[PDB]
Symmetry: D2
Subunit: 406 residues, 4 copies
Amino acid sequence: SLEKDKIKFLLVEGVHQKALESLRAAGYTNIEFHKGALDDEQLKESIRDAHFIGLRSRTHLTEDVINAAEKLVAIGAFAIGTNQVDLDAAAKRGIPVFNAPFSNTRSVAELVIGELLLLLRGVPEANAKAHRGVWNKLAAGSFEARGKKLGIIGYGHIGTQLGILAESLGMYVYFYDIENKLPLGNATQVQHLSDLLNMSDVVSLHVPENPSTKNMMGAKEISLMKPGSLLINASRGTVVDIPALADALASKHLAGAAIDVFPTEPATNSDPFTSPLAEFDNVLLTPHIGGSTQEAQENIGLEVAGKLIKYSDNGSTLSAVNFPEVSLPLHVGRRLMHIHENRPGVLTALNKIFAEQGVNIAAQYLQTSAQMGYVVIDIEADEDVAEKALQAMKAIPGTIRARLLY
Amino acid sequence: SLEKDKIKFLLVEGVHQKALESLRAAGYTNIEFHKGALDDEQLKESIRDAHFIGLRSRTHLTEDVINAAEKLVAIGAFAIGTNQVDLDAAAKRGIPVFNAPFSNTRSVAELVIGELLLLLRGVPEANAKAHRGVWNKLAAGSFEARGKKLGIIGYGHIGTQLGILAESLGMYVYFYDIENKLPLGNATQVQHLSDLLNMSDVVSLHVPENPSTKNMMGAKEISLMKPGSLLINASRGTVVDIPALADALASKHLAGAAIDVFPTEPATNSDPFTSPLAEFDNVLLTPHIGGSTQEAQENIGLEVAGKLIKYSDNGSTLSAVNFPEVSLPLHVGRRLMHIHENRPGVLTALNKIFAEQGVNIAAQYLQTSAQMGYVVIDIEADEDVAEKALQAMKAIPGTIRARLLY
Amino acid sequence: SLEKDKIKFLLVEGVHQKALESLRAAGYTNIEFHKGALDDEQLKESIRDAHFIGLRSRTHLTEDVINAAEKLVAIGAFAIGTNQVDLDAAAKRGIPVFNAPFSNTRSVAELVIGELLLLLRGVPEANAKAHRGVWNKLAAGSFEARGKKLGIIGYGHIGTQLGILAESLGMYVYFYDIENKLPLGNATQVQHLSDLLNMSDVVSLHVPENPSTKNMMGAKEISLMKPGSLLINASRGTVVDIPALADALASKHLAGAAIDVFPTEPATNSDPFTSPLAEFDNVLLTPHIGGSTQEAQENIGLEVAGKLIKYSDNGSTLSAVNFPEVSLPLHVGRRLMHIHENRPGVLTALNKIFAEQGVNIAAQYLQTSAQMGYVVIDIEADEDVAEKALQAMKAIPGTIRARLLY
Amino acid sequence: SLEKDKIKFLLVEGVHQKALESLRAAGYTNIEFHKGALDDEQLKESIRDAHFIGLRSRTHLTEDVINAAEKLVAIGAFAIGTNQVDLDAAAKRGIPVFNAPFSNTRSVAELVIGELLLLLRGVPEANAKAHRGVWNKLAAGSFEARGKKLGIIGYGHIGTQLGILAESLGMYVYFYDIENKLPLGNATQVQHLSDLLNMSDVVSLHVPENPSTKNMMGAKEISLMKPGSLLINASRGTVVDIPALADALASKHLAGAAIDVFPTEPATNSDPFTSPLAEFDNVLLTPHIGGSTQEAQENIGLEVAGKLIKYSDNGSTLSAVNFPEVSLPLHVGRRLMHIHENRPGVLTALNKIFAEQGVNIAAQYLQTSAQMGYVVIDIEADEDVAEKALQAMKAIPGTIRARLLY
Ligand SMILES: NC(=O)C1=CN([C@@H]2O[C@H](COP(=O)(O)OP(=O)(O)OC[C@H]3O[C@@H](n4cnc5c(N)ncnc54)[C@H](O)[C@@H]3O)[C@@H](O)[C@H]2O)C=CC1
Ligand SMILES: NC(=O)C1=CN([C@@H]2O[C@H](COP(=O)(O)OP(=O)(O)OC[C@H]3O[C@@H](n4cnc5c(N)ncnc54)[C@H](O)[C@@H]3O)[C@@H](O)[C@H]2O)C=CC1
Ligand SMILES: NC(=O)C1=CN([C@@H]2O[C@H](COP(=O)(O)OP(=O)(O)OC[C@H]3O[C@@H](n4cnc5c(N)ncnc54)[C@H](O)[C@@H]3O)[C@@H](O)[C@H]2O)C=CC1
Ligand SMILES: NC(=O)C1=CN([C@@H]2O[C@H](COP(=O)(O)OP(=O)(O)OC[C@H]3O[C@@H](n4cnc5c(N)ncnc54)[C@H](O)[C@@H]3O)[C@@H](O)[C@H]2O)C=CC1
């Protein structure tokens, strides 16, 4: 309450109000909120005395910005992505970076369901025509989704949810994953990708962005899809050979597609968009909105705020993307924490401080990345003894930062 | 087998092959099939010795055509509609007309589900832009369907199926119907339309075409919808005031819409299409395809063929749209039938024929519209006695037609 | 209202109150109700001026009783069975007999579910012991129902409901039926009975009582069941060779059983019960209560009352067990009905009455069993003309009875 | 492989074979298996060189037995209970004790479902009579489960599963829990117990054994149940006032009950059983078999074996019932562990060993109960250096035990 009032939370780019509700319910009310992106100079001014900052995709938390933030304890990327933030620079200063990598699984699943529905029915095509005054009711090849085969690639958080929704619509779900998984409902793992592609009326992609998925769907892979099928991609902009796809649409080997993500995307609603696909009416083209809904924002705000709250209240760095992960249950005494370089001697030095005072260490957890180490410490002591100890902890060769959580 | 070979079935406009499978399985193989619309003179030539004709929307079974068909027993409209066929002229000659009014409930339901999904997510709009090179990711007002309220108007065959699919997607279903109905799953009847319209995020229409539904959704009704909601219409082209709708889209009172049907529709894929709505990207415009899928055609072919088969095998006119409805279970003896004008005296005359011969009438069913009457008759007799009886039946004052089913 | 007050309904053996609610809602309030079985002399006195009687299993509607009932139009067996009623004697006097053959499908299904649950767990056995002071927790061979195979014999009204409940419990359902059927959920028809019996952990019987099911489960059939399995019978008391069953329990080829029905059952709660099975604690023995619940009584009361109401209001004999079945939709004019012996000449005579008066017969339906015939007749006329006509109808050689429904 | 062959696993009282499959799949094959309970002297002989022992309810792991086990690393109670094992004595020697507290949730849920089914239908009662030659079909008060209200007390692992099964049967589920919980399906938390008891047709108990649940259902609580309802208890033998219950059965305030657990239970199938309830046929009495099925044994064997495997492979004491809980993810280097008395100085001493050698501690986790502490340690070193270090670790004042996992 009286200590907490003094911990400043800088929220920019308009994170969801639910984030500020969590913050207040946890006793943190010292919040500077902005709907808009702070510019370089107004950012440097606002972050200067900020304990935490939550941000989105437009803010550039850069080495200099981070290096100028003089009280900064942690960073919250209220989004999935994290590239606007310099993870190493935050690391070096003992600043863990949190985010929300699966707060939007429902949004993406629905989008796919809706897309394959209309695609199977030649609707994006007829609808482009109708707005042009041409009326082309072409029913010969339209189908109902029920009874048909969905091929999911990437049976992860989104894939599994997709498969469930697809079963409610009466489709048969099949998936390919580089690792083996336990199916839900009547899903079915398929061993080689060749079989999936062959038998699927609809193939949808839910994989991550790395070298194994780069151009994963290319001319060869596409021509294994069954004639007249559909390809949907709302995963990552690098997973599909757009020009191969364009060919297979022009040759009518595929009856249509939907793409929500591209190799390069406009930075802003006011930049021009370019794609070979723009020429096909039977293709649905969406500006990276797969995970973009009000519900997704509510989730993101709740999660990431919670993480910041937890790290502040008890030091947990579980799921931090730039730090070593550590969490310790609450039990009586005082908790302290200490970040430092990963060198022989530190842990002892740290512990020594307590032994030589005859203080009982109740629990301790320490984890360590290539160059850094972080460690939480519970101890049975007076506030007096803790403070003094903090000081001594700060002194230890290799110490980056330390703190007395309570 | 030997009698049946001689009963000709004229199929035009390419009805589904399943129709010809039913026909053959029932022992009828004398089929003249055409994928295309026969023209007036080639129609008059093909129908001339045809016992049955199945057709679709393009054929004009007109008084003259019907009057020239010299052996025509019944007509099968392999479609929902029936306006290409002159019902009275068929009636007058004792020709019942069958059709398929609910073979496509799934198709329409899916279309709606797919449409409200993408509509809720501003997808038709972003996708029109993307094809124009403009990239407008506008997520502030996009929602997931789950948790939201669907208002169904017309809880009939399609409505009930819609409500079920919508519940699987996790929506709350509410419906308004001029008559009271038993809800499925967790549906909920709403008493006045005002409440439905007020609370619904999505309103979809599944009513018939008559004077009570004509312009049913007009400026007043639309402005009772909740701000930012969606209106979908895949029922009949007369149910929505297109210009009121256009206003409510231009004023952003509604966030979007989908319309599959219009007051006047192009006769052909090669005619121009016109609507005030063509100017809104956030509106989905589809060329009457609600019920247009391969599955729907399979159903239609199965149903209507079955009806023709039944009427031919046992005289049932259940669901005939231009005749009085009659059906009688099979039990031993000979079945005969007789169509005639609805006048005093006929039934007696008909029965007299059997009494005076000392023949036992086992069963009989007679139904009667304003001017016509139809009656099936089972009797315990020899083929010899039946034939003679048929003759006498033909003689009866007011007789239109008669037949000895077996 | 004024005519209806005069139609007496005699209800004995305490049918459910819902029966009297239907009766009153339909405008019939002249009801003599008895919770108890009327005895021969008090029955003859109460039925004497009764238009309808509803009864249960204890009343003996016999030839004499029926022959003494001087105003009796129809009989309602508020039960499944009908053997206390002399069907032919009722027939001869043109009295249709209704009943309720599937008002209790849920009750029987639940009973089976509950029984196989406890049987699989050796519970009836441990529980007989516990009440005797012996404590025998014998878990080696107890199983959960989930994952196990239920074999249903008789995939009829009860079978299908059973299969559904069993799937909710996570069992695999298989069925054998002498006729081919469309499975629900994931049920599975099995061709020969041998396969069903072999693979089933639990076999339950839901077949009718006739010569094909008599002793259907006998020593040979039982020894095809898988070792340690269970047999449940709540169908008919003649379907299982009780002594074969007794052997297979004594040899531990079967781990247990439940039987709700027997070749001969005590007439009364005060008669002694005898069975070879009484000696096995691992057998559940229930006194024909499969369909005995308050809900079942509510259904029975609603159905059978409805039927009586329908027959009285519009003459329908649909599902009558002793009459020829006939039903006709309502359309303007006056309805009359006529029961008579199945002889040449009657129908004409009947129709003649209307022709010679120049009255238009709007509809007519006539059905005919081996010796009897029943026929409903709509006609366009004045009340005056109808009455006179009724009289003439009564006159017709072979006439048993006639009536002017409205 | 070569090290693992030398780690002896002593399994007694016939744990499930799946336990030995897990053991072998993990590379541990040195197993001494016994279907039977070893007696004191044959136990002391077999455990003498045993690294682990798995046991059930009959074995008395006592201070002396434990103190004589000279190589004993951990104990596996392949059961829920743990009272045959002296937890403190195991603790003092740094022996964690594992068990399986929720491997049988399905078994107990099914038992309840089956019991309330037959109870609602007066079946245990009619069935006791039938075996005595008396036939009492008493249907007036029998009900179907569907539509009825189940009151669950203890919405824990078993409660939640129960509620799900009950919903599939079409019941309405309500629960009371001393803590607040998130409902599944359409369950419903009820605030005071008074409301639950009042509205429930069936009340079933799934709470733990402690002072708050002792005699929780007593005369007052029972008389709040609705007249004619049922009480089921398969939780703990101390939760229900058996004599109050007996009164409420004798007064017909309750229509029946099922009890699987008692204040004192026979030690053996050959001991006599005593209860006031034995006198009521409408009560189901089962010898503590709620969780007793073959599936439950498979679960128990899998879990507990897994835990032993984990503790042996990586030191995890997660869910140990007598130890402080600690778990650490795998990452390169050597893992060691150390149990010791909870005194100032130890951790430093331990760490010192590595610093002064210039060895980098990669991770460390330490947890601490009232008198004991346990700590796992990863370190970057040679096997040589690890061994030497182990030795030094063993030397530390207060050290109880230490080990070099790999
Ligand atoms: N369109 C949009 O706005 C959004 C896109 N996404 C993206 O969707 C993707 C999936 O999302 P999540 O389910 O959260 O991912 P996840 O991590 O839960 O699942 C990824 C799955 O892919 C599998 N996998 C990895 N490489 C593979 C390969 N080469 N071939 C086959 N399977 C492979 C993994 O085993 C895992 O099951 C992510 O890339 C995420 O960034 C997420 C949210 C929104
Ligand atoms: N877009 C397309 O290609 C297709 C459109 N349709 C049309 O959809 C409509 C509904 O189809 P079905 O479910 O088969 O109809 P249905 O006859 O089964 O149900 C119509 C329902 O509307 C109710 N109703 C009638 N007038 C009403 C009013 N004034 N206000 C509220 N409720 C009213 C009726 O009580 C009934 O439940 C029909 O007009 C059908 O022609 C059908 C197939 C395809
Ligand atoms: N225990 C009790 O209190 C009650 C017993 N029942 C009895 O249960 C039986 C079934 O009830 P419902 O489902 O209403 O009957 P149902 O008539 O709906 O189904 C009977 C089924 O058995 C099949 N079948 C007939 N003979 C067969 C044979 N030889 N082998 C295999 N299948 C055969 C038929 O195809 C049909 O599907 C009836 O006998 C009924 O009287 C009904 C209510 C209560
Ligand atoms: N009959 C048998 O063979 C078996 C009996 N059991 C027993 O069943 C009981 C429940 O099992 P689980 O679901 O695993 O327990 P659980 O620990 O998962 O749930 C116990 C629940 O009771 C609630 N609770 C505790 N005290 C309460 C009180 N005073 N009033 C209302 N709620 C209270 C807790 O909040 C918790 O939700 C345990 O005692 C277990 O030992 C378990 C297996 C077999």
